[PDB]
Design a protein around this ligand. Sequence first.
Ligand SMILES: CCCCCCCC/C=C/CCCCCCCC(=O)O[C@@H](COC(=O)CCCCCCCCCCCCCCC)COP(=O)([O-])OCC[N+](C)(C)C
Ligand SMILES: CCCCCCCC/C=C/CCCCCCCC(=O)O[C@@H](COC(=O)CCCCCCCCCCCCCCC)COP(=O)([O-])OCC[N+](C)(C)C
Ligand SMILES: CCCCCCCC/C=C/CCCCCCCC(=O)O[C@@H](COC(=O)CCCCCCCCCCCCCCC)COP(=O)([O-])OCC[N+](C)(C)C
Ligand SMILES: CCCCCCCC/C=C\CCCCCCCC(=O)O[C@@H](COC(=O)CCCCCCCCCCCCCCC)COP(=O)([O-])OCC[N+](C)(C)C
Ligand SMILES: CCCCCCCC/C=C\CCCCCCCC(=O)O[C@@H](COC(=O)CCCCCCCCCCCCCCC)COP(=O)([O-])OCC[N+](C)(C)C
Ligand SMILES: CCCCCCCC/C=C\CCCCCCCC(=O)O[C@@H](COC(=O)CCCCCCCCCCCCCCC)COP(=O)([O-])OCC[N+](C)(C)C
Ligand SMILES: CCCCCCCC/C=C\CCCCCCCC(=O)O[C@@H](COC(=O)CCCCCCCCCCCCCCC)COP(=O)([O-])OCC[N+](C)(C)C
Ligand SMILES: CC(C)CCC[C@@H](C)[C@H]1CC[C@H]2[C@@H]3CC=C4C[C@@H](OC(=O)CCC(=O)O)CC[C@]4(C)[C@H]3CC[C@]12C
Ligand SMILES: CC(C)CCC[C@@H](C)[C@H]1CC[C@H]2[C@@H]3CC=C4C[C@@H](OC(=O)CCC(=O)O)CC[C@]4(C)[C@H]3CC[C@]12C
Ligand SMILES: CC(C)CCC[C@@H](C)[C@H]1CC[C@H]2[C@@H]3CC=C4C[C@@H](OC(=O)CCC(=O)O)CC[C@]4(C)[C@H]3CC[C@]12C
Ligand SMILES: CC(C)CCC[C@@H](C)[C@H]1CC[C@H]2[C@@H]3CC=C4C[C@@H](OC(=O)CCC(=O)O)CC[C@]4(C)[C@H]3CC[C@]12C
Ligand SMILES: CC(C)CCC[C@@H](C)[C@H]1CC[C@H]2[C@@H]3CC=C4C[C@@H](OC(=O)CCC(=O)O)CC[C@]4(C)[C@H]3CC[C@]12C
Ligand SMILES: CC(C)CCC[C@@H](C)[C@H]1CC[C@H]2[C@@H]3CC=C4C[C@@H](OC(=O)CCC(=O)O)CC[C@]4(C)[C@H]3CC[C@]12C
Ligand SMILES: [Cl-]
Ligand SMILES: [Cl-]
Ligand SMILES: [Cl-]
Ligand SMILES: [Cl-]
Ligand SMILES: [K+]
Ligand SMILES: [K+]
Ligand code: NA
Ligand code: NA
Lengths: 470, 470
Amino acid sequence: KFGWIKGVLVRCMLNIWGVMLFIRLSWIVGQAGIGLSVLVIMMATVVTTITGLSTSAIATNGFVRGGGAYYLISRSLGPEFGGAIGLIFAFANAVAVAMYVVGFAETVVELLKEHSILMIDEINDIRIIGAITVVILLGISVAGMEWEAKAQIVLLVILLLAIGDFVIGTFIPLESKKPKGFFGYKSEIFNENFGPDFREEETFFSVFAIFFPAATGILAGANISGDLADPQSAIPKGTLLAILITTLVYVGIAVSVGSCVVRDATGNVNDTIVTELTNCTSAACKLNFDFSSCESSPCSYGLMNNFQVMSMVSGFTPLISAGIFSATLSSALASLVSAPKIFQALCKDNIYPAFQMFAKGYGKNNEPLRGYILTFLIALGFILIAELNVIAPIISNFFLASYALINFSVFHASLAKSPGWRPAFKYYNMWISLLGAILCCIVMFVINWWAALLTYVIVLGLYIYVTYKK
Amino acid sequence: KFGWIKGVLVRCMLNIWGVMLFIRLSWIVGQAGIGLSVLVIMMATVVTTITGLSTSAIATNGFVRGGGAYYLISRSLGPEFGGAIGLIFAFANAVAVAMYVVGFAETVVELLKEHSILMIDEINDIRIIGAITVVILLGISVAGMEWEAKAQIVLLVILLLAIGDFVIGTFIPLESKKPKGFFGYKSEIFNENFGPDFREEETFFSVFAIFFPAATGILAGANISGDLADPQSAIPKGTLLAILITTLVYVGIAVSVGSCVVRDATGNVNDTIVTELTNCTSAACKLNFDFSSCESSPCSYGLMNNFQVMSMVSGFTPLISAGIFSATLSSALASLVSAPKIFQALCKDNIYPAFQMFAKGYGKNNEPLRGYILTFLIALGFILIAELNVIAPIISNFFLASYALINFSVFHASLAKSPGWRPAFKYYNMWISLLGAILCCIVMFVINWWAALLTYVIVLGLYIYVTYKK
Ligand SMILES: CCCCCCCC/C=C/CCCCCCCC(=O)O[C@@H](COC(=O)CCCCCCCCCCCCCCC)COP(=O)([O-])OCC[N+](C)(C)C
Ligand SMILES: CCCCCCCC/C=C/CCCCCCCC(=O)O[C@@H](COC(=O)CCCCCCCCCCCCCCC)COP(=O)([O-])OCC[N+](C)(C)C
Ligand SMILES: CCCCCCCC/C=C/CCCCCCCC(=O)O[C@@H](COC(=O)CCCCCCCCCCCCCCC)COP(=O)([O-])OCC[N+](C)(C)C
Ligand SMILES: CCCCCCCC/C=C\CCCCCCCC(=O)O[C@@H](COC(=O)CCCCCCCCCCCCCCC)COP(=O)([O-])OCC[N+](C)(C)C
Ligand SMILES: CCCCCCCC/C=C\CCCCCCCC(=O)O[C@@H](COC(=O)CCCCCCCCCCCCCCC)COP(=O)([O-])OCC[N+](C)(C)C
Ligand SMILES: CCCCCCCC/C=C\CCCCCCCC(=O)O[C@@H](COC(=O)CCCCCCCCCCCCCCC)COP(=O)([O-])OCC[N+](C)(C)C
Ligand SMILES: CCCCCCCC/C=C\CCCCCCCC(=O)O[C@@H](COC(=O)CCCCCCCCCCCCCCC)COP(=O)([O-])OCC[N+](C)(C)C
Ligand SMILES: CC(C)CCC[C@@H](C)[C@H]1CC[C@H]2[C@@H]3CC=C4C[C@@H](OC(=O)CCC(=O)O)CC[C@]4(C)[C@H]3CC[C@]12C
Ligand SMILES: CC(C)CCC[C@@H](C)[C@H]1CC[C@H]2[C@@H]3CC=C4C[C@@H](OC(=O)CCC(=O)O)CC[C@]4(C)[C@H]3CC[C@]12C
Ligand SMILES: CC(C)CCC[C@@H](C)[C@H]1CC[C@H]2[C@@H]3CC=C4C[C@@H](OC(=O)CCC(=O)O)CC[C@]4(C)[C@H]3CC[C@]12C
Ligand SMILES: CC(C)CCC[C@@H](C)[C@H]1CC[C@H]2[C@@H]3CC=C4C[C@@H](OC(=O)CCC(=O)O)CC[C@]4(C)[C@H]3CC[C@]12C
Ligand SMILES: CC(C)CCC[C@@H](C)[C@H]1CC[C@H]2[C@@H]3CC=C4C[C@@H](OC(=O)CCC(=O)O)CC[C@]4(C)[C@H]3CC[C@]12C
Ligand SMILES: CC(C)CCC[C@@H](C)[C@H]1CC[C@H]2[C@@H]3CC=C4C[C@@H](OC(=O)CCC(=O)O)CC[C@]4(C)[C@H]3CC[C@]12C
Ligand SMILES: [Cl-]
Ligand SMILES: [Cl-]
Ligand SMILES: [Cl-]
Ligand SMILES: [Cl-]
Ligand SMILES: [K+]
Ligand SMILES: [K+]
Ligand code: NA
Ligand code: NA
């Protein structure tokens, strides 16, 4: 089978490290400050850590036999909690597929813009590339899965190499890169970038909703709990270590990109300030550059305007593009196999008879082709809207709802003293799980109150329907 | 004992008819349109009608013995729903006391301003008068309750006389009243006032939130269900007829004041337009008055600026002041006797052991003096804030919460097929109750999302605590 490392840690890191690490973290650091983005990352880390503690408590309760995160949750805490969590998580993964594919397509379109290869329009090209990508990924999922075990390590190595390449690039200031920002590690840039600089229609929690899908993916290790040799011990430590490593990398990258790149920058070489005019207080002014004229007009570079800041900073640019592709495609593929399997397992249990027609599977491996079609349609529908910053809040809402369900389910089972609930995890507390559920609920209401209200209305309706069923 | 007219209908109408009907309905008609105010009244009427159907189902379920709405709810529908509903309703009545007393104090200060009798400040005078009024009302509730049976009829007669006096006043246009608006029943004024004219920080639901406490008070007939001769027949028809009559009066008054008084008006006599300037399209311009110059400056008269439009329109001004006092004081007294009784009944059941110290009662009639002190403190604290337009949304939030609890609890009992749930009401449907609960929840999030979220988190915490208790 799979050892704890290759079965939980690698998959969790690959699912967590997705689209926001490379093409949105720098923008988040620009919009907030360095310290305030550290606060955002810490809040997401607290949410995912409490959810991971709850998930480990679920894993340590019961028997090894049985695979899938929905299976463990349903056999541990109630048909009603199992069904609600499974449905919400399946929808969350289905829309996460779209978010990751849109990030990949945006990166591809940005790379094509360098060669001036435009087919119809930037948004239209993003839509076309996303549709092609999701079709290809669905074909890969339904046809080729034996290569996945060998490809996980390759993708993780490529992503780590891209991260190291960016970190190396931050330590090599270049004169050519200076007009586009990236003056190197300077105290002036750190001082300027420490405070928030939110623009119009940008707040702390909008940026948090953009970032939060980065922290998601912690349930990748539990999704193949059956495939693990010792799921009761592999899942807890694997998930917790993956959360720790990804959070440390996020914090380090945020601080580095905030301390090495200015918020606003032009892209023209002959912008130097030989004689200071009125003693400009900007960090770029102290670095012999004049970006004061940029803020009046639209800027095309800097933390606030360029989503490919990390690609620019890195010494070997195509490695980062491979890293972006690796991260986005790995996360999209992980979410594209998690949702159909969860939906099929939910339909086998016949929790909702309306969805029972999706229980049919085809092939030797019992592939949920009907479920695959449903998740493909959901992902495609969310790809026809081709903005990462509008899709990401939806991902945040649904993953926060799933995490609140998991935390509240374990807390309610501990409080009710359910006969089948006796977790063996040492670091699980029912009150910390309740705190995590409350935090997720409050955060998802703060991000978007009506979307959250609709989510809870649906969740309560499903819970009541399953509770009172024939 | 008490019949359905003097025991349900009269008290329900007296509790429903309060501060808004007299000092905020004209302002609501000004802010919204005539049609939009009619829509507001219809939405409130739908909410209260569904809640009344649920309450009638509760009343028809069970046995006659036992008094108080909380008693019927708890005996019919669980200890958990009963306790949550009782606590939320007690808090709602405690803050409604403050709302009604603040409205009375605002009317008193407005009357005193005519004689230029100012003690400290308008807000400070409102606060002082409200504190004195709530102290006197608490003393009345503690000591004198035998007069109340003979006082309900007198208060209702006075209020109806005030309503009729206003309606008569609308039919007697006067030259002296014309500068302050009130040009009589004219088609020009109706056409102008039909469309919304919301000001800054005023929306449909903020106006709805301000109006909604007017429609509340439908459970006053149920709070003395023990005192009724035949509660299972007295409560349903009495409550429904009271809702119908009050809604018809609200609609008629709204249409009348919108069709007889202009939105903005000055207060100076020599404002006449002998020759039209640029063919002014305002209704007042067509009525030989020039209020165009008023819109640039702050206006002191009209629907938008005067809260005592109905007092001005009526032929006998002191009668309306008696009507305002009668309505406000009757509703405040009803809430101030409902809240302590419900809290004491809740504390007797020992649903929440933290509140058990409030179960003690003094006197021959077992007056909850400890409970009276708590509601007096809550009302006083909400009187220290002396704006009706800010207290009223809180009242809307908490009464909508109580109504959603009642509707959802009866729907859940019907769905769960509880052993003690077998309502005899012919016009009760569980799906209509569920729709009413959903409507109340959605409306209370629309009015104020974080207040509604806090209320529902508290309600869920209470429900879970009672469910899993020793
Ligand atoms: C903004 C985002 C942050 C969220 C803010 C709110 C965070 C609030 C978080 C709250 C978490 C609770 C922390 C209590 C810690 C006590 C430690 C202890 O030893 O107690 C002990 C007993 O004593 C108790 O039972 C604890 C009392 C819990 C009551 C909770 C109120 C909060 C509910 C919601 C408040 C709503 C707040 C809104 C208020 C308007 C432990 O209990 P036990 O039973 O012995 O455990 C054994 C179980 N076992 C046998 C299975 C092993
Ligand atoms: C704080 C207090 C105030 C709270 C109020 C706040 C408002 C919150 C409101 C919360 C809403 C909760 C209402 C419960 C839902 C109805 C459940 C039900 O009746 O099932 C019944 C009917 O079943 C059906 O008729 C069809 C099943 C529909 C699935 C359920 C709703 C899903 C909502 C999402 C839709 C997603 C699609 C839309 C989005 C794309 C089951 O059949 P039965 O025979 O009647 O049961 C008897 C069984 N017994 C005999 C064993 C007992
Ligand atoms: C997508 C969907 C996501 C859903 C998640 C998102 C929603 C999350 C919603 C979460 C709602 C919060 C639930 C909390 C549960 C209560 C804890 C409890 O049960 O009793 C605890 C005690 O607790 C106390 O002794 C304190 C008093 C009661 C606690 C507070 C309820 C009021 C909530 C705040 C009011 C503040 C008022 C402020 C006024 C200004 C446990 O004590 P025990 O002795 O161990 O119990 C033994 C019982 N047993 C033997 C059966 C085990
Ligand atoms: C929030 C989004 C919606 C939430 C989920 C929707 C949940 C809907 C889920 C399931 C729908 C229920 C289907 C009923 C069939 C189930 C079996 C059954 O009970 O038969 C029923 C047939 O009743 C009907 O067939 C009428 C259909 C009712 C649909 C509306 C419920 C309110 C929706 C609100 C939408 C608000 C929209 C927003 C408003 C602002 C028979 O029951 P009964 O005979 O009537 O009971 C008599 C009891 N008695 C004997 C004591 C008198
Ligand atoms: C999906 C179809 C639903 C149809 C049924 C419902 C009919 C439509 C119902 C209500 C319709 C109301 C439309 C908006 C009109 C303005 C309202 C307003 O006052 O602003 C408020 C919200 O409004 C917004 O934030 C605007 C953004 C659009 C969100 C719209 C409500 C979604 C309802 C989702 C329904 C989920 C369940 C769905 C059930 C099917 C916020 O104003 P505020 O100033 O921030 O408040 C602060 C208060 N304070 C100042 C005192 C602190
Ligand atoms: C305590 C336990 C019990 C649970 C009850 C807890 C109750 C909650 C307590 C508190 C809730 C906060 C109340 C603030 C009132 C502002 C009103 C307002 O402006 O409306 C807006 C406020 O929603 C926002 O988006 C604002 C978020 C940033 C502002 C931050 C201030 C502190 C919020 C820190 C709060 C977290 C505290 C710590 C938690 C981590 C909403 O309208 P909108 O955003 O324009 O609509 C967006 C729609 N769209 C996305 C489609 C565009
Ligand atoms: C924003 C949304 C607005 C609407 C929600 C507003 C809050 C609603 C507040 C109160 C409503 C009342 C609870 C809901 C209906 C429960 C009915 C039920 O199933 O009973 C069950 C018990 O229930 C429990 O054991 C604990 C309750 C957990 C319900 C959790 C759903 C989480 C969704 C959270 C989504 C909302 C998150 C809230 C914060 C935003 C089963 O009971 P039984 O089978 O009869 O067996 C009893 C055996 N006994 C007799 C021995 C004990
Ligand atoms: C998850 C762990 C780390 C506990 C964190 C709890 C609090 C310490 C966090 C949760 C919500 C955070 C708040 C969320 C929103 C804001 C608004 C934010 O204001 C801005 O948007 C920037 C305005 C400006 O300074 O220019 C200031 C930080 C603050 C108060 C945050 C302060 C820190 C808070 C209270
Ligand atoms: C893969 C990630 C997640 C973990 C590994 C982290 C390394 C990629 C980082 C951490 C410390 C960094 C080093 C910190 C200090 C330096 C010194 C710095 O200066 C030089 O040695 C000479 C530079 C030159 O002239 O080229 C060169 C980059 C380097 C090795 C950095 C290379 C990249 C390092 C090893
Ligand atoms: C992916 C993660 C796990 C590894 C990356 C973490 C570190 C390699 C980065 C992140 C934060 C960076 C620090 C951010 C700020 C500074 C201040 C900087 O100070 C100056 O040189 C300016 C002072 C001056 O010369 O005047 C020294 C480099 C340093 C420590 C950076 C060193 C490299 C750090 C530690
Ligand atoms: C039996 C009846 C009472 C059922 C009512 C259900 C709907 C017909 C009601 C419920 C919510 C109402 C809506 C609540 C909020 C608004 C926003 C409101 O916006 C404005 O204030 C526009 C101001 C302007 O015209 O300048 C317009 C009315 C409307 C759509 C209302 C239209 C009628 C709605 C949909
Ligand atoms: C909640 C209850 C109190 C509502 C009762 C309705 C009456 C108060 C309204 C409904 C019809 C109205 C009547 C409609 C028509 C007229 C004719 C009208 O004739 C005149 O203009 C006489 C002029 C004058 O007397 O100087 C006098 C008002 C009056 C009686 C109105 C008086 C007030 C009435 C009776
Ligand atoms: C407490 C309530 C139930 C008492 C009943 C209310 C009626 C006495 C009021 C409310 C609406 C009023 C109506 C609102 C608008 C008009 C239009 C108005 O039209 C004209 O005057 C046209 C003449 C012109 O301007 O040339 C005639 C009076 C009338 C029917 C009003 C008659 C008196 C009404 C019915
Ligand atoms: Cl991501
Ligand atoms: Cl996840
Ligand atoms: Cl009122
Ligand atoms: Cl009421
Ligand atoms: K992720
Ligand atoms: K009322
Ligand atoms: Na990834
Ligand atoms: Na009254």
